[PDB]
Ligand binder design. Structure first.
Ligand code: ZN
Length: 193
């Protein structure tokens, strides 16, 4: 969560990023997340808790500080996934940007729909739900993000340790919350190491 350098990113913003991610992963794991394809997203049997990672934030920073809205190429973030977001409000509070970015990515579920088949098929990936799927990717347990105030945008980049969005793999295992992990509160649905 912390022990990160004084590099332009604030503790408040890191906190918000992590809290939003774990909170939203919990909502999904508990069967409480509204799915645009109908009903709610399926309950998750072993949705893993995320931790904040300063090293992942550094590579997210490398993208953000370029002030060009685009995905970085894989080898500029070796082994990591990535979500990107922008707002025209360039001087936005960094925690506010974290909240807005996290909501925009997660919103893909409610807006575009995913459905009850969580295998990441070519069909599913091409529908543009890939920011959401990375946020709730079961095996992704490291989060690191950077918010950069650019000339004409606030630019937010999050990166994700173990990369998610592996084609042909399930986003997460379906089952009752905590049913396939030990360190997990049935009312939260998040598995700790
Ligand atoms: Zn994207």
């Amino acid at each position: 969560k912390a022990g990160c350098p004084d590099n332009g990113m604030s503790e408040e913003a890191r906190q918000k990023f992590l809290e939003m991610h774990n909170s939203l992963r919990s909502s999904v794991a508990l069967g409480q997340a509204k799915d645009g394809a109908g009903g709610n997203a399926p309950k998750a049997a072993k949705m893993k808790t995320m931790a904040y990672d300063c090293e992942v934030e550094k590579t997210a920073m490398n993208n953000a500080k370029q002030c060009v809205f685009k995905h970085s190429q894989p080898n500029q973030r070796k082994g990591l996934g990535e979500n990107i977001f922008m707002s025209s409000d360039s001087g936005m509070d960094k925690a506010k940007a974290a909240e807005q970015a996290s909501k925009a990515w997660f919103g893909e579920l409610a807006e575009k729909g995913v459905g009850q088949n969580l295998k990441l098929t070519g069909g599913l990936f091409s529908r543009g739900v890939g920011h959401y799927t990375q946020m709730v990717w079961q095996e992704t347990v490291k989060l690191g993000c950077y918010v950069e105030a650019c000339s004409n945008m606030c630019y937010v980049v999050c990166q994700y340790g173990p990369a998610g969005n592996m084609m042909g793999k399930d986003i997460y295992e379906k089952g009752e919350p905590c049913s396939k992990c030990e360190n997990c509160d049935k009312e939260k649905g998040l598995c700790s190491a």
